[PDB]
Every structure is written in structure tokens, then in C-alpha cells.
Design a protein around this ligand. Structure first.
Ligand SMILES: NC(=O)C1=CN([C@@H]2O[C@H](COP(=O)(O)OP(=O)(O)OC[C@H]3O[C@@H](n4cnc5c(N)ncnc54)[C@H](O)[C@@H]3O)[C@@H](O)[C@H]2O)C=CC1
Ligand SMILES: NC(=O)C1=CN([C@@H]2O[C@H](COP(=O)(O)OP(=O)(O)OC[C@H]3O[C@@H](n4cnc5c(N)ncnc54)[C@H](O)[C@@H]3O)[C@@H](O)[C@H]2O)C=CC1
Lengths: 299, 298
């Protein structure tokens, strides 16, 4: 294979490096000899990341939903990289948000995941884009199988579908500047994103204030019956985060970066294939394992 | 065959002032449905009332106003009583600012996402108990723009998002016998997409654009891009009834489809192109795009 040269002279900006993919990426690209700028949400996230990495790495406190903070951070990066520009932007920061049946939710429940996963990713992209153009560099967007195949109710799937759409508008707009745009679609991975207990604890808070009608339709025990089911399929979840960082690595360092990478044997052989199937067949296969409502005719 | 007792069934349609929503309100009124036509403007609803039977009611709805949506859902709940709401057609939408991504701020993305996604979701969540009651139909108007990305701006993200929400809703509602249909129109002559309106927004943005971007694209880029939009306004459907016919099948068929494609453009070019890898989409979609004056001026 043909890799790029002068990795040591190139800067990579990564969002959400406190935990998960972003943290392993910051550490992996620091070892590789890139100059990493690791955006962290929390002081302890950045202190633990600094403590584990070389002097080539800098950390910045970034909340991607704070437009002043994003603009300041882009100003800082612009001074520091000067005429090298910014070789690599990895939009990794994301949250699950509330995940529940659609008919349990209000529109406000949809706001948080869209604000981080879409608006935050867009604003960071628009603020760094002049620097990535300058370097003729790489924008890497972290999507989800949830951006090709809808999860249950909540803003996560809409936010990820939207990222897929923005990613393609950006790729086509940037082809003229020699800037490559790569979309990464991970399967299910053990990170801090998706915590069966955290997810069940949010469903229970919603249940507490849910109308009598919905409670009668689903039935008492629905939440706990559907946790016994989530836990039946927690074995088939990747613990190897490097399958995703390897994809970021190829998108950063390959002379021929792919427009889409799929991480996880789950994703390559089940989820993405299922995303190409007509809805009749997706609904058939996805609904086979769903908890029966107590009183569906109580409408 | 078709359902029975069309005359006993209510259909709520958003954005009936103009375009698909207007033709749908009129077509379903003629068909003998009891239409509740949500209009953005007083003059939109006065002209719609004036052209339709006494079976039709109009309500003033801004889908981005959550108080207005909740009030309208209360009004509908009283009026349909125990029939519930047989049909919800989420039709209301706007294009927003359409321009190269590197011209835009995040704020430019907000309006189309607020109408096309948040507005559609909030109207859906407020009417859903009534649609469950009727064991009825939710019909979401997407776009080829929700399967294949248009230029920069929030329209394509909003439409991709609708496609995602549509599938979450279909799967959540299968247990209540509620069917969910997604309509993907090609390009149609409505008030949505107006080459002159689109060019007039690009020019206002140009006026405040950084020296760097202006050098890269070059003076005349916008006007060269209008000469090109106007070269391909022949290949734009004038027959809005191709879309309302799809809504009709989704409302009245015992076997409503999960997705309808309207336009010969959409069936034979756009949707096929949406299944191709990016190398091939970018090849075909970029062939006809205005060369930048100084792309290396970065
Ligand atoms: N782990 C999985 O199974 C899947 C993960 N993904 C995506 O991978 C990306 C990374 O998440 P994971 O590493 O899995 O989880 P994680 O929660 O461990 O990492 C997400 C990161 O986002 C940061 N973050 C959250 N809100 C932020 C904000 N407002 N501003 C700045 N940073 C913020 C957190 O500090 C954290 O470092 C996300 O975009 C997620 O949607 C994709 C598909 C599924
Ligand atoms: N016309 C086309 O070629 C295409 C249209 N579509 C979709 O068709 C749908 C209907 O639009 P068209 O009839 O084509 O355009 P249009 O502009 O003629 O109709 C849109 C309707 O939405 C209403 N509306 C706009 N903002 C609103 C708000 N905040 N609250 C309530 N109502 C509001 C307007 O009053 C109007 O009646 C849209 O969702 C659009 O995205 C799909 C693909 C392309």
C-alpha cells in the first residue's frame, strides 16, 4: 500500500477524546507521530489523556454544542497550525440521547442527540474547513449503522441519517479543493455511549410521567421484560475499539481513502446488508424479537 | 381492494396553502374524505375554503410553533371524537438556504431542519394517539434529497432525518395496526424550489462572504450557476397529481406501500443513483457543476 508522507508534520483535530473511539484515536495517532489536538468535554478527560500521551499532543476543552467555544477553539487551531493547515478533522463527539418507543416521547426528547451529533458536527466542520482546505486534508465523520438502518424511537437515528446526508453534501462540495471526506459506520461497540442500565433508567423516568393510556397499552413490566431481551444479545457486542480507529487510520494516512468504512463483523455481514433490503423484509427480521404489548387494542 | 367508508374518515394535511398539500386537500375533499387542511397563512386558507365543499375545515398551523401544534391537536381530538384520525399527511416543508457548504454558518441549517424534521415530528407525536385510535395511516413527504444529498444547506440533512424517523415510527406502530408511508417526489413545479429565490439568497450570502471564498469561486460563479439551473428546468414535472395519487394509494389501499416514488426522473434516474457507491454518484452529479475560478487559492 501507499501511505502519505510527513505524518510528523501533520495535525489531526479529534472531538470527544475523554472516552471511547476518540480517546483510543488520540492515543493511536499520538503513537503514530501525528500532532494530535484532542478536544475533550471534561477537565479530567483531558488530564488523563495528557498524562498518557507525548508532548506532540495538545488537549482543548470543547463542548461542540457551544458556538463561541467552537469558534475560539478554531481560532486557537488556526494560530497553532499556521500555513500547514489542518490535515485531519475527526468528528467523533456524539451521545445516544433518550431511546424509547416513539409514542412515549415529546419533540424535546429528540433535541439533544441532534444538537451534538448533527449541529455540533456541522459547526465544528464549518469552523475547521478553511484549515482543512489549506492542507488539502481529510474530514472523517463518525456515523452509525443507525444512520443507514433506523433504531427505535428517539433522535439518535434521525441525527445519524442527517450526518450521512451532510457528509455527502460536504464530499461533493470539497472534491474541487482536493479535500477527501470519509464516513465511518461502526456496529455496536462497548464504549460509554450505550449503557443498558442508563438506557433503562431513562425509560423508567419517562414511564413515571407517561399517560394512563400508554401505560395500559404497553403494560406494567414492559420495560423490565425488554431489559431481559437487551441482555440476551449483549454477548454479540465488539470490545475491540481498534477496528474503528484502524478505519480512521486508513482515512487519515491512505493515498486512496474510502468514502465509507464499516467497522464490526456484525455491521459488514448483517446490519448494512439489512439496510439495503426493502422495509417489508427489514421489519420482518427486526421485529421477530420485540416484546408483545399487554393491550394493543386499548387505543 | 380499497378501504370502505371514506366519507366517515378524517385526513389532517399540513401546508395546504400551495403545492402538494393544496392539491391533496382539494383532491381528498372531492373524493369524500373529511379534510382538515392546516395552512400557514389566512389567505392560503380563505382561497382553499372558497374552492372546497362544507366537508372541509381549515386551521392556521405553523408546524414550528409547539403551542399552535398542541392547540390544533386539541381541536382535532374534539372534532373527530371516537372516529380518531384516519390519515396524517406531513407535507409542510421549506428548502432553506442552498449554497456550497463552505459559504454557510450552522444557523443556515436550522430553518429547514426546524420545519421539515422537528415540525413533522411534533405534529406526528401530537396526532399519533388519534391515528392509533383509528388504526390509520401516517404519510411522510420526504424527497430524493433524503436518499441522495443535494448541495450544501439543511434541506438534505432534514430529509435524511425524516427517512430515519419514518422507519422508527413504522416499526413502533406495527403493533397498533398503524401503517406508515414515505413519499419521495422527484423535482416538481411548486413554490418550494425557485431558481430566482435560490440565487437571491446566494447573492445576500456573497455580499458578506470572506475575501478568500470570493477568490476561490470567482466573480460570476453565482450567475454562471443560474444559467445552468435554467438549462435543466425543462426536466421538472408540472403534474403535482403524480404525488397526490401516491398519497391517495397510501390513504385508501388495504395494502399501502412503505415507500412511493413520484416522477419518471425519480423512478429511472435519482433512486437508482442513490443505491450506487459515492465514486459513481460523485462522477455523474459533478459532471454538470461550475468550475471554481481559483480552487488552489486556499
Ligand atoms: N459505540 C457504538 O456502538 C456506536 C458508536 N458510534 C458513534 O461513535 C462516536 C463516539 O462515541 P463512543 O466512543 O461510542 O462513546 P463515548 O460516549 O465513550 O464517546 C463519545 C465522546 O463524545 C464526547 N462528547 C459528548 N457530548 C459532547 C459534547 N457536547 N461536546 C463535546 N464532546 C462531547 C464524550 O466526552 C466522549 O468522549 C459517537 O458519535 C457515536 O454515535 C457509532 C455507532 C454505534
Ligand atoms: N417540490 C419538489 O420538487 C419537492 C418537494 N418535496 C416536498 O414536498 C413537500 C411540499 O412542498 P411543495 O408543495 O413542493 O412546496 P410549497 O412551498 O408549494 O408547499 C409547502 C407548504 O408548506 C407550508 N409551510 C411552510 N413552512 C411552514 C411552517 N413553518 N408551518 C406550516 N406550514 C408551513 C407552506 O405554506 C406550503 O403550503 C415539502 O415537504 C417538500 O420538501 C419533495 C421533494 C422535492
Amino acid at each position: 500500500q501507499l501511505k502519505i508522507a510527513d505524518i510528523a508534520d501533520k495535525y489531526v483535530f479529534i472531538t470527544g477524546c475523554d472516552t471511547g473511539f476518540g480517546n483510543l484515536a488520540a492515543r493511536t495517532f499520538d503513537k503514530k507521530g501525528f500532532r494530535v489536538i484532542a478536544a475533550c468535554l471534561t477537565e479530567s478527560g483531558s488530564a488523563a489523556l495528557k498524562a498518557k500521551t507525548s508532548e506532540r499532543l495538545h488537549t482543548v476543552l470543547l463542548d461542540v454544542t457551544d458556538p463561541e467555544n467552537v469558534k475560539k477553539t478554531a481560532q486557537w487551531v488556526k494560530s497553532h497550525v499556521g500555513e500547514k493547515g489542518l490535515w485531519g478533522l475527526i468528528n467523533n463527539a456524539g451521545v445516544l440521547g433518550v431511546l424509547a418507543p416513539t409514542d412515549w416521547l415529546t419533540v424535546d426528547d429528540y433535541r439533544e442527540p441532534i444538537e451534538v451529533n448533527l449541529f455540533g458536527l456541522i459547526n465544528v466542520t464549518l469552523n475547521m474547513l478553511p484549515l482543512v482546505k489549506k492542507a488539502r486534508g481529510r474530514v472523517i465523520n463518525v456515523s452509525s449503522i443507525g444512520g443507514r438502518l433506523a433504531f427505535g424511537g428517539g433522535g439518535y437515528t434521525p441525527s445519524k441519517y442527517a450526518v450521512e446526508g451532510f457528509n455527502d453534501s460536504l464530499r461533493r462540495d470539497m472534491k474541487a479543493f482536493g479535500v477527501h471526506v470519509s464516513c465511518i459506520e461502526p456496529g455496536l461497540f462497548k464504549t460509554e455511549l450505550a449503557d443498558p442500565i442508563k438506557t433503562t433508567e431513562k425509560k423508567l423516568a419517562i414511564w413515571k410521567h407517561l399517560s394512563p393510556d400508554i401505560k395500559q397499552q404497553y403494560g406494567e413490566g414492559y420495560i423490565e421484560k425488554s431489559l431481559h431481551r437487551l441482555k440476551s444479545n449483549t454477548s454479540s457486542v465488539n470490545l475491540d475499539l481498534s477496528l474503528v480507529v484502524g478505519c480512521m487510520d486508513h482515512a487519515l494516512t491512505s493515498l486512496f481513502p474510502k468514502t465509507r468504512y464499516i467497522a464490526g463483523k456484525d455491521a459488514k455481514t448483517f446490519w448494512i446488508p439489512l439496510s439495503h433490503m426493502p422495509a417489508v423484509l427489514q421489519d420482518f427480521l427486526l421485529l421477530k424479537q420485540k416484546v408483545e404489548l399487554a393491550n394493543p387494542k386499548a387505543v
